JSON list of C-alpha atoms in Angstrom, two decimals:
[
{"chain": "B", "resi": 1, "resn": "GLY", "atom": "CA", "xyz": [-7.63, -41.60, 4.81]},
{"chain": "B", "resi": 2, "resn": "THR", "atom": "CA", "xyz": [-4.56, -43.22, 3.35]},
{"chain": "B", "resi": 3, "resn": "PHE", "atom": "CA", "xyz": [-5.82, -46.55, 2.10]},
{"chain": "B", "resi": 4, "resn": "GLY", "atom": "CA", "xyz": [-3.14, -48.66, 0.76]},
{"chain": "B", "resi": 5, "resn": "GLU", "atom": "CA", "xyz": [-5.57, -51.60, 0.56]},
{"chain": "B", "resi": 6, "resn": "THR", "atom": "CA", "xyz": [-5.73, -54.71, -1.78]},
{"chain": "B", "resi": 7, "resn": "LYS", "atom": "CA", "xyz": [-2.07, -55.06, -2.34]},
{"chain": "B", "resi": 8, "resn": "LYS", "atom": "CA", "xyz": [-2.80, -58.56, -3.56]},
{"chain": "B", "resi": 9, "resn": "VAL", "atom": "CA", "xyz": [0.60, -60.13, -2.97]},
{"chain": "B", "resi": 10, "resn": "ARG", "atom": "CA", "xyz": [1.28, -63.86, -3.35]},
{"chain": "B", "resi": 11, "resn": "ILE", "atom": "CA", "xyz": [3.85, -65.37, -1.15]},
{"chain": "B", "resi": 12, "resn": "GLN", "atom": "CA", "xyz": [5.62, -68.80, -1.48]},
{"chain": "B", "resi": 13, "resn": "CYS", "atom": "CA", "xyz": [6.27, -71.36, 1.25]},
{"chain": "B", "resi": 14, "resn": "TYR", "atom": "CA", "xyz": [9.16, -73.62, 0.05]},
{"chain": "B", "resi": 15, "resn": "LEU", "atom": "CA", "xyz": [12.34, -73.65, 1.87]},
{"chain": "B", "resi": 16, "resn": "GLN", "atom": "CA", "xyz": [14.90, -73.82, -0.85]},
{"chain": "B", "resi": 17, "resn": "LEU", "atom": "CA", "xyz": [17.80, -75.31, 0.88]},
{"chain": "B", "resi": 18, "resn": "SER", "atom": "CA", "xyz": [17.88, -78.78, 2.23]},
{"chain": "B", "resi": 19, "resn": "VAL", "atom": "CA", "xyz": [20.30, -80.23, 4.86]},
{"chain": "B", "resi": 20, "resn": "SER", "atom": "CA", "xyz": [21.01, -83.95, 5.44]},
{"chain": "B", "resi": 21, "resn": "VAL", "atom": "CA", "xyz": [22.94, -84.88, 8.55]},
{"chain": "B", "resi": 22, "resn": "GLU", "atom": "CA", "xyz": [25.49, -87.86, 9.18]},
{"chain": "B", "resi": 23, "resn": "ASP", "atom": "CA", "xyz": [27.13, -88.35, 12.50]},
{"chain": "B", "resi": 24, "resn": "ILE", "atom": "CA", "xyz": [30.44, -90.05, 12.06]},
{"chain": "B", "resi": 25, "resn": "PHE", "atom": "CA", "xyz": [31.48, -91.80, 15.30]},
{"chain": "B", "resi": 26, "resn": "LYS", "atom": "CA", "xyz": [35.04, -91.80, 16.47]},
{"chain": "B", "resi": 27, "resn": "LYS", "atom": "CA", "xyz": [37.20, -92.43, 19.46]},
{"chain": "B", "resi": 28, "resn": "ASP", "atom": "CA", "xyz": [37.24, -89.26, 21.59]},
{"chain": "B", "resi": 29, "resn": "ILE", "atom": "CA", "xyz": [36.70, -86.91, 18.69]},
{"chain": "B", "resi": 30, "resn": "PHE", "atom": "CA", "xyz": [33.45, -86.47, 16.41]},
{"chain": "B", "resi": 31, "resn": "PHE", "atom": "CA", "xyz": [32.57, -85.63, 12.90]},
{"chain": "B", "resi": 32, "resn": "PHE", "atom": "CA", "xyz": [29.54, -84.07, 11.22]},
{"chain": "B", "resi": 33, "resn": "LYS", "atom": "CA", "xyz": [28.98, -84.72, 7.70]},
{"chain": "B", "resi": 34, "resn": "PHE", "atom": "CA", "xyz": [26.42, -82.41, 5.82]},
{"chain": "B", "resi": 35, "resn": "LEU", "atom": "CA", "xyz": [24.75, -82.88, 2.43]},
{"chain": "B", "resi": 36, "resn": "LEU", "atom": "CA", "xyz": [23.33, -79.59, 1.16]},
{"chain": "B", "resi": 37, "resn": "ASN", "atom": "CA", "xyz": [21.20, -79.28, -1.93]},
{"chain": "B", "resi": 38, "resn": "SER", "atom": "CA", "xyz": [18.41, -77.36, -3.36]},
{"chain": "B", "resi": 39, "resn": "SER", "atom": "CA", "xyz": [14.71, -78.07, -2.75]},
{"chain": "B", "resi": 40, "resn": "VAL", "atom": "CA", "xyz": [13.54, -78.75, -6.33]},
{"chain": "B", "resi": 41, "resn": "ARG", "atom": "CA", "xyz": [15.63, -79.75, -9.31]},
{"chain": "B", "resi": 42, "resn": "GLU", "atom": "CA", "xyz": [15.31, -76.69, -11.48]},
{"chain": "B", "resi": 43, "resn": "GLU", "atom": "CA", "xyz": [16.00, -73.85, -8.85]},
{"chain": "B", "resi": 44, "resn": "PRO", "atom": "CA", "xyz": [19.80, -73.63, -8.06]},
{"chain": "B", "resi": 45, "resn": "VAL", "atom": "CA", "xyz": [20.98, -72.18, -4.86]},
{"chain": "B", "resi": 46, "resn": "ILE", "atom": "CA", "xyz": [24.08, -70.11, -3.97]},
{"chain": "B", "resi": 47, "resn": "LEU", "atom": "CA", "xyz": [25.58, -70.41, -0.45]},
{"chain": "B", "resi": 48, "resn": "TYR", "atom": "CA", "xyz": [27.55, -67.82, 1.55]},
{"chain": "B", "resi": 49, "resn": "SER", "atom": "CA", "xyz": [28.39, -69.22, 5.01]},
{"chain": "B", "resi": 50, "resn": "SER", "atom": "CA", "xyz": [27.83, -72.25, 7.17]},
{"chain": "L", "resi": 1, "resn": "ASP", "atom": "CA", "xyz": [52.36, -78.18, 3.10]},
{"chain": "L", "resi": 2, "resn": "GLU", "atom": "CA", "xyz": [53.88, -80.53, 5.69]},
{"chain": "L", "resi": 3, "resn": "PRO", "atom": "CA", "xyz": [52.94, -83.98, 4.57]},
{"chain": "L", "resi": 4, "resn": "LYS", "atom": "CA", "xyz": [53.38, -85.53, 8.11]},
{"chain": "L", "resi": 5, "resn": "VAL", "atom": "CA", "xyz": [49.73, -85.08, 9.46]},
{"chain": "L", "resi": 6, "resn": "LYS", "atom": "CA", "xyz": [48.70, -86.92, 12.42]},
{"chain": "L", "resi": 7, "resn": "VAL", "atom": "CA", "xyz": [44.94, -87.00, 12.60]},
{"chain": "L", "resi": 8, "resn": "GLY", "atom": "CA", "xyz": [43.27, -83.62, 13.28]},
{"chain": "L", "resi": 9, "resn": "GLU", "atom": "CA", "xyz": [44.88, -81.04, 11.07]},
{"chain": "L", "resi": 10, "resn": "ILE", "atom": "CA", "xyz": [42.40, -79.30, 8.52]},
{"chain": "L", "resi": 11, "resn": "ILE", "atom": "CA", "xyz": [44.94, -78.49, 6.13]},
{"chain": "L", "resi": 12, "resn": "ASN", "atom": "CA", "xyz": [44.55, -76.38, 2.88]},
{"chain": "L", "resi": 13, "resn": "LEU", "atom": "CA", "xyz": [45.74, -77.76, -0.46]},
{"chain": "L", "resi": 14, "resn": "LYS", "atom": "CA", "xyz": [47.03, -75.27, -2.84]},
{"chain": "L", "resi": 15, "resn": "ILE", "atom": "CA", "xyz": [46.61, -75.47, -6.76]},
{"chain": "L", "resi": 16, "resn": "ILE", "atom": "CA", "xyz": [48.19, -73.22, -9.20]},
{"chain": "L", "resi": 17, "resn": "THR", "atom": "CA", "xyz": [46.81, -73.32, -12.61]},
{"chain": "L", "resi": 18, "resn": "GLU", "atom": "CA", "xyz": [48.11, -71.67, -15.65]},
{"chain": "L", "resi": 19, "resn": "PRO", "atom": "CA", "xyz": [46.46, -72.23, -19.30]},
{"chain": "L", "resi": 20, "resn": "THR", "atom": "CA", "xyz": [49.07, -73.08, -21.92]},
{"chain": "L", "resi": 21, "resn": "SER", "atom": "CA", "xyz": [49.67, -71.87, -25.51]},
{"chain": "L", "resi": 22, "resn": "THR", "atom": "CA", "xyz": [46.61, -73.63, -26.60]},
{"chain": "L", "resi": 23, "resn": "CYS", "atom": "CA", "xyz": [44.61, -70.98, -24.82]},
{"chain": "L", "resi": 24, "resn": "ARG", "atom": "CA", "xyz": [44.02, -69.67, -28.38]},
{"chain": "L", "resi": 25, "resn": "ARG", "atom": "CA", "xyz": [42.04, -72.94, -29.29]},
{"chain": "L", "resi": 26, "resn": "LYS", "atom": "CA", "xyz": [38.54, -73.05, -27.96]},
{"chain": "L", "resi": 27, "resn": "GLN", "atom": "CA", "xyz": [37.47, -69.56, -26.29]},
{"chain": "L", "resi": 28, "resn": "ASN", "atom": "CA", "xyz": [33.67, -70.19, -26.72]},
{"chain": "L", "resi": 29, "resn": "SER", "atom": "CA", "xyz": [33.81, -72.16, -23.37]},
{"chain": "L", "resi": 30, "resn": "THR", "atom": "CA", "xyz": [35.05, -69.58, -20.86]},
{"chain": "L", "resi": 31, "resn": "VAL", "atom": "CA", "xyz": [34.66, -72.03, -17.78]},
{"chain": "L", "resi": 32, "resn": "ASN", "atom": "CA", "xyz": [36.22, -75.47, -17.41]},
{"chain": "L", "resi": 33, "resn": "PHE", "atom": "CA", "xyz": [35.58, -77.87, -14.49]},
{"chain": "L", "resi": 34, "resn": "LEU", "atom": "CA", "xyz": [38.27, -79.52, -12.13]},
{"chain": "L", "resi": 35, "resn": "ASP", "atom": "CA", "xyz": [37.45, -82.63, -10.46]},
{"chain": "L", "resi": 36, "resn": "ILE", "atom": "CA", "xyz": [39.94, -83.28, -7.67]},
{"chain": "L", "resi": 37, "resn": "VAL", "atom": "CA", "xyz": [40.09, -87.11, -7.35]},
{"chain": "L", "resi": 38, "resn": "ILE", "atom": "CA", "xyz": [41.30, -89.11, -4.32]},
{"chain": "L", "resi": 39, "resn": "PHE", "atom": "CA", "xyz": [43.36, -92.28, -4.60]},
{"chain": "L", "resi": 40, "resn": "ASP", "atom": "CA", "xyz": [44.80, -94.54, -1.89]},
{"chain": "L", "resi": 41, "resn": "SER", "atom": "CA", "xyz": [48.43, -95.18, -1.91]},
{"chain": "L", "resi": 42, "resn": "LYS", "atom": "CA", "xyz": [48.05, -98.86, -2.44]},
{"chain": "L", "resi": 43, "resn": "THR", "atom": "CA", "xyz": [44.53, -99.53, -3.73]},
{"chain": "L", "resi": 44, "resn": "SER", "atom": "CA", "xyz": [42.47, -97.12, -5.97]},
{"chain": "L", "resi": 45, "resn": "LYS", "atom": "CA", "xyz": [39.18, -95.26, -6.31]},
{"chain": "L", "resi": 46, "resn": "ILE", "atom": "CA", "xyz": [38.12, -93.90, -2.89]},
{"chain": "L", "resi": 47, "resn": "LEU", "atom": "CA", "xyz": [34.29, -93.13, -3.34]},
{"chain": "L", "resi": 48, "resn": "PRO", "atom": "CA", "xyz": [33.52, -89.25, -2.95]},
{"chain": "L", "resi": 49, "resn": "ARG", "atom": "CA", "xyz": [31.37, -89.52, 0.37]},
{"chain": "L", "resi": 50, "resn": "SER", "atom": "CA", "xyz": [34.77, -90.59, 1.72]},
{"chain": "L", "resi": 51, "resn": "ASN", "atom": "CA", "xyz": [34.04, -91.50, 5.45]},
{"chain": "L", "resi": 52, "resn": "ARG", "atom": "CA", "xyz": [37.05, -92.81, 7.64]},
{"chain": "L", "resi": 53, "resn": "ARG", "atom": "CA", "xyz": [39.06, -90.86, 5.05]},
{"chain": "L", "resi": 54, "resn": "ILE", "atom": "CA", "xyz": [39.71, -87.57, 3.92]},
{"chain": "L", "resi": 55, "resn": "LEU", "atom": "CA", "xyz": [36.71, -85.09, 4.60]},
{"chain": "L", "resi": 56, "resn": "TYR", "atom": "CA", "xyz": [36.58, -81.90, 2.56]}
]
């Protein structure tokens, strides 16, 4: 009876990145502006691709 | 490259940096920071959010 019970893990619920959207209108073309930052102001984020 | 750009050309800018003979001076900072700033030809100080302008 392999009991691996009571692994008392604590998990966090805070999405660390934060994305702000800005829709620049233009004639026959379009532009998206994207402000990306961290959730809280002591945990910095690295980014790899978008 | 090619300074006649119409509207829709995402074009890379190339910067070549070389530290001088005063590379011997400081050396306790190992990183320095390079703000690229944007001026109009006639007027000055384009704000860095920069809509209807260069987007980066």
